[PDB]
Curated annotation (Swiss-Prot), chain B:
PROSITE patterns: RIBOSOMAL_L6E. Belongs to the eukaryotic ribosomal protein eL6 family. This is Large ribosomal subunit protein eL6. It is found in: Cytoplasm; Nucleus; Nucleus, Nucleolus. One of its GO terms (cellular component) is cytosol. The modification Phosphoserine is found at S80, S90. GO terms for molecular function: RNA binding; structural constituent of ribosome. The keyword Endoplasmic reticulum does not apply. Component of the ribosome, a large ribonucleoprotein complex responsible for the synthesis of proteins in the cell. The small ribosomal subunit (SSU) binds messenger RNAs (mRNAs) and translates the encoded message by selecting cognate aminoacyl-transfer RNA (tRNA) molecules. The large subunit (LSU) contains the ribosomal catalytic site termed the peptidyl transferase center (PTC), which catalyzes the formation of peptide bonds, thereby polymerizing the amino acids delivered by tRNAs into a polypeptide chain. It comes from Schizosaccharomyces pombe (strain 972 / ATCC 24843) (Fission yeast). Component of the large ribosomal subunit (LSU). Mature yeast ribosomes consist of a small (40S) and a large (60S) subunit. The 40S small subunit contains 1 molecule of ribosomal RNA (18S rRNA) and at least 33 different proteins. The large 60S subunit contains 3 rRNA molecules (25S, 5.8S and 5S rRNA) and at least 46 different proteins. GO terms for biological process: cytoplasmic translation; ribosome biogenesis.
Curated annotation (Swiss-Prot), chain C:
Keywords: Cytoplasm, Ribonucleoprotein, Ribosomal protein. It holds the Pfam family Ribosomal_L22. It comes from Schizosaccharomyces pombe (strain 972 / ATCC 24843) (Fission yeast). It is found in: Cytoplasm. Belongs to the universal ribosomal protein uL22 family. There are 2 genes for uL22 in S.pombe. Gene3D superfamilies: Ribosomal protein L22/L17 (3.90.470.10). GO terms for biological process: cytoplasmic translation. The keyword Ribonucleoprotein applies. The keyword Lyase does not apply. This is Large ribosomal subunit protein uL22A. Transmembrane segments: none annotated. Component of the ribosome, a large ribonucleoprotein complex responsible for the synthesis of proteins in the cell. The small ribosomal subunit (SSU) binds messenger RNAs (mRNAs) and translates the encoded message by selecting cognate aminoacyl-transfer RNA (tRNA) molecules. The large subunit (LSU) contains the ribosomal catalytic site termed the peptidyl transferase center (PTC), which catalyzes the formation of peptide bonds, thereby polymerizing the amino acids delivered by tRNAs into a polypeptide chain.
UniProtKB/Swiss-Prot annotation, chain D:
Belongs to the MAK16 family. It comes from the Eukaryota. A motif (Nuclear localization signal) lies at residues 136-141. GO terms for cellular component: cytosol; nucleolus; nucleus; preribosome; preribosome, large subunit precursor. GO terms for biological process: assembly of large subunit precursor of preribosome; maturation of 5.8S rRNA; maturation of LSU-rRNA. This is Protein mak16. It comes from Schizosaccharomyces pombe (strain 972 / ATCC 24843) (Fission yeast). Keywords: Cell cycle, Cytoplasm, Nucleus. It is found in: Cytoplasm; Nucleus.
Swiss-Prot record, chain E:
This is Brix domain-containing protein C4F8.04. It comes from the Eukaryota.
Length: 106, 170, 148, 192, 61, 124
RNA sequence: UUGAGAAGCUCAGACGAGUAGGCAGGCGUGGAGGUUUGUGACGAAGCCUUGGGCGUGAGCCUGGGUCGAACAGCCUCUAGUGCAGAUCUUGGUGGAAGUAGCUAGAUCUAGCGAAACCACAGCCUGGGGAACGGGCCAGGC
RNA sequence: GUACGUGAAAUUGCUGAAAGGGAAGCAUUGGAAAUCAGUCUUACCUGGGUGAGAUCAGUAGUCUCUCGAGACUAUGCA
């Protein structure tokens, strides 16, 4: 059919790292469909979230969300830097993300 | 009880005066815009007027069932669909106090609802519906004049596979 | 006194205790591990078999220096022995727990060894290792149909 | 005098000083601020005014340099009206031409002592649970005797003894609904 | 069950519960996240018994 | 005014987790050939004055108040003027007869007590 | 404007590796003078704790449990005052080990039973300059 | 409970939970699970009514200090 999907699919690649030092405060996010740093400027400031599930349920809901915001582009290939309210776990490398269309300026 | 009992360091005189918000160029009244967040996410609605910060927006009741509601201007995508005639409907009644949440009051005495929990319930007054019934009366002919507008606002916006929001124009 | 296990309330438990028993601590730890959780009637047969070398006690933890045996396949291993002095002490304690349960008026057909623990008594270059042994026997807990 | 007194008490030893990490406090009853300072020391300040409470009434206490060697007559006392506006003016009139810092600190203490009396009156009207102490000896005694009582109770033995007893007496109808047919047959043969 | 709200007292609850058709009122006293007392009163004017609970153990335990 | 803590983890003594004989309390490493003293990469941190917290918010609890140890009612009355800066903390050796009278007195004074519900029960 | 512990308060700028060594201020322990009109059988001290808090730190405060008769903060005085090492001293206790073996029965079983040693570990291949392989780096397992 | 006040650490047994391809191992950042602190609206302002009483009386006494300053007593509550 056709769902809602008012967001854009994205992937968690890695932390902002050098060769041997990592900085989990900033995460590198690949917004799929964005292919250059100029294109990444559209998604700057948008709200990105990591939706996952836990077996224990809270308020009758098993879905937990970590909210973040895209800060700046990273590299020439359209990858961006995102800072989350809680630093994303290291195990979520390659995990999917949702990039909202808000806040909007179009 | 009135002479200040403590040091009470008064805040220094701030120099942050309140100036009116500058809305976007394309967020004009009568624009068909897509709601991005809330319970009506994806719904297309018609902008009646711009409040101090938000947009007093509504979808026609008989089209998509979106009542007269405030929406933040950052949470709205303004599509380039043809404008709707809104100069014919008065919007002075849509103020900050009009949408303001009714004050949580009620001098409930001890016991009964205070303890036994026989609480009352809320309901939208017919006054809000009466004003609402007027706006679609002055808006439905406008949307019916141009083709597909009635069907446009009924549908809900969504993103399909291979849709790049940065590239494709709204 | 108080035992190591939260059971041994009057409800369904019969206690037997042996302090400063003159037996090796490492041997007793293996015998206790074997008969733990097993029914009281079956335990008497097992201890009877070991005395007649019909059955062997598998040594799991302190398995050092224990030869291969063909009687340990019941427990999944092959290192087993036939301790007698340690088994004799456990036979005396089990009879004491069985007699305590009988005096309590407990149902004797459902008794199982709920808890058995061996602790090291004070040591007394030939300081051997005496053993503290405590045994709790209780009925097998059962369910009842709810409403239908 | 005053500068000699302060050096002896403020910097060598005062029995009223509570040495805290961020600040030093004063155990003196005649200190307006409750802190150990040069200006709030009642001992080192020959002219000193404070407000304190006696059985629900706030009084202005003042001492002068000329009564410093008569401890029984050192401090003079006046009544401050329950009306706050009149109480402020009473401090202003009695402390006339005193330094503005001393009048300021007396009016600040009058506000805190008025709020405390107000809060004391409102606590009396309210119904608040009474705090009852926990006695370590009685808790140990009751915990041990309870363990003996629970063992001596034999709950399961006594529960099933009564349940069977009321089965015999037929507290139920003709045949009970909680018993299997075979058990009920055994009951009938045994009881008759 | 009725959650205890605001500043309603036991005697007020008893007088309010009596007119609502209640026969016995049970009040559970808890502090520091532990129930330690139980007072039951017999409406409307019956004797009130004050107990102290101990060794509380729910079904899961 | 918000309390900012430069660090929340304590500074443990080096090699304190490998030996029970070596306590967790911080000891300066005197070894010259020690990697911890020379501050290599991966080595633990050491107490430096840079970690010192803001003077204004120093000694402040997360609720914004500074602890004041109280042994009797006379101690708690000192906080009449400083009830918005300090919280009463009844000492551990003060009996339950005095803990109740300190808590009732601190209630009228408008003073927060950090351990007001200790060694007592309630009776509504 | 109250912000005179003038030993306080306040404003500004620069600066921050560190062995030997130099200097300053603090934390903790036993006892002594003074003090807190101090704490304590309604529970002192001690100990336990994935309870909480404070301090850059030494450390300190506190809840719960255990416990049972004493004890502490502040100013000063005093010293047999702070430990991971000394093939340290005394005591306790481990792995080695139910091993090496030494009393019975039929090499097996039973019974009785050590000591040396012990930073921790335990697959290779290379390179890693100072050995580096056992810890390090790139590869196999 | 005479293996007797308190009863630490090393060490041992049992039970529970978790982890586990030839080490553990600690640090940094989060997740998960468990478990805690950790808090709330309740008071202020402005009334009006009702009565209440003193620090109010177009009031009378006593006591202690020094006229008037505190403590009370009787009466009125305008």
């Amino acid at each position: 059919a056709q769902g809602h999907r008012l967001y854009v699919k994205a992937k968690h690649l890695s932390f902002q790292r050098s060769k041997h030092v990592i900085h989990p405060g900033t995460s590198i996010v690949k917004i799929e469909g964005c292919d250059s740093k100029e294109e990444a400027q559209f998604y700057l400031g948008k709200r990105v979230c990591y939706v996952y599930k836990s077996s224990k349920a809270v308020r009758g809901s098993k879905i937990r969300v970590i909210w973040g915001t895209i800060a700046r582009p990273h590299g020439n290939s359209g990858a961006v830097r995102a800072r989350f309210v809680h630093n994303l776990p290291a195990k979520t490398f390659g995990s999917s993300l949702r990039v909202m269309l808000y806040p909007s300026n179009i | 009880k009135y002479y200040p009992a403590y040091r009470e360091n008064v805040p220094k005189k701030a120099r942050k005066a309140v100036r009116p918000t500058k809305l976007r160029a394309s967020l004009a009244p009568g624009t068909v815009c897509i709601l991005l967040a809330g319970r009506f996410r994806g719904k297309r609605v018609v902008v009646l007027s711009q409040l101090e910060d938000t947009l007093v927006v509504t979808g026609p009741y008989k089209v998509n069932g979106v009542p007269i509601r405030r929406v933040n201007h950052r949470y709205v995508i303004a599509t380039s669909a043809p404008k709707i005639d809104v100069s014919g409907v008065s919007v002075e009644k849509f103020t900050k106090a009009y949408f303001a949440k009714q004050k949580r009051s009620g001098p409930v005495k001890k016991d009964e609802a205070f303890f036994a929990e026989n609480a009352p319930k809320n309901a939208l007054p017919a006054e809000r519906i009466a004003d609402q019934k007027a706006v679609d009366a002055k808006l439905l002919p406008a949307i019916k004049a141009i083709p597909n507008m009635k069907e446009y606002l009924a549908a809900s916006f969504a993103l399909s596979n291979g849709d790049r929001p940065h590239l494709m124009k709204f | 006194v108080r035992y190591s296990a939260s059971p041994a309330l009057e409800t369904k438990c019969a206690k037997a205790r042996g302090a400063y028993l003159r037996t090796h601590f490492k041997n007793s730890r293996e015998v206790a591990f074997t008969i733990n959780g097993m029914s009281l009637k079956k335990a008497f047969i097992f201890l009877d078999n070991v005395k007649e070398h019909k059955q062997a006690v598998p040594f799991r933890r302190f398995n050092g220096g224990v030869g291969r045996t063909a009687q340990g396949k019941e427990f999944g291993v092959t290192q087993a022995r036939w301790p007698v002095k340690s088994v004799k002490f456990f036979y005396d304690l089990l009879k004491n727990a069985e007699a305590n349960a009988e005096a309590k008026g407990l149902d004797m057909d459902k008794l199982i060894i709920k808890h058995v623990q061996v602790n090291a008594a004070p040591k007394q270059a030939y300081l051997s290792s005496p053993s503290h042994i405590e045994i709790i026997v209780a009925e097998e807990e059962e369910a009842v149909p709810k409403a239908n | 005098q005053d500068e000699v007194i302060w050096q002896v008490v403020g910097h060598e030893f005062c029995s009223y000083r509570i040495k805290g990490e961020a600040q030093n406090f004063c155990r003196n009853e005649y200190n307006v601020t409750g802190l150990c300072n040069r200006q709030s020391c009642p001992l080192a300040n020959s002219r000193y005014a404070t407000v304190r409470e006696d059985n629900g009434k706030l009084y202005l206490y003042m001492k002068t340099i000329e009564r410093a060697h008569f401890p029984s007559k050192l401090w003079q006392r006046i009544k401050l009206s329950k009306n706050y506006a009149k109480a402020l003016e009473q401090i202003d009139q009695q402390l006339l031409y005193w330094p503005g810092r001393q009048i300021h600190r007396c009016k600040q203490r009058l506000t805190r002592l008025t709020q405390y009396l107000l809060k004391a009156r409102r606590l009396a009207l309210k119904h608040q649970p009474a705090l009852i102490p926990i006695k370590p000896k009685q808790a140990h005694r009751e915990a041990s005797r309870e363990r003996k009582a629970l063992i001596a109770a034999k709950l399961e033995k006594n529960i099933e003894k009564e349940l069977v007893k009321r089965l015999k007496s037929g507290v139920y109808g003709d045949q009970p609904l909680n018993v299997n047919e075979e058990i009920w047959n055994k009951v009938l043969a045994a009881r008759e | 069950f009725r959650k205890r709200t605001g500043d309603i007292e036991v005697h007020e609850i008893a007088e309010a519960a009596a007119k609502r058709g209640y026969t016995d009122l049970l009040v559970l006293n808890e502090d520091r996240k532990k129930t330690n007392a139980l007072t039951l009163v017999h409406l409307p004017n019956g004797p009130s018994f004050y107990f102290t609970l101990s060794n509380l153990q729910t079904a899961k335990e | 005014v918000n309390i900012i803590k430069k660090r929340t983890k304590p500074f443990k003594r080096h090699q304190s987790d490998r030996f029970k004989r070596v306590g967790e309390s911080w000891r300066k490493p005197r070894g010259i050939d020690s990697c911890v003293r020379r501050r290599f990469r991966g080595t633990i941190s050491m107490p430096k004055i840079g970690y010192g917290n803001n003077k204004k918010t120093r000694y402040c609890m997360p609720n914004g108040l500074k602890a004041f140890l109280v042994r009797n009612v006379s101690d708690v009355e000192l906080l009449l003027m400083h009830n918005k800066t300090y919280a009463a903390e009844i000492a551990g050796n003060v009996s339950a007869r005095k803990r109740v009278e300190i808590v009732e007195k601190a209630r009228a004074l408008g003073v927060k007590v950090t351990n007001a519900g200790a060694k007592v029960r309630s009776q509504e």
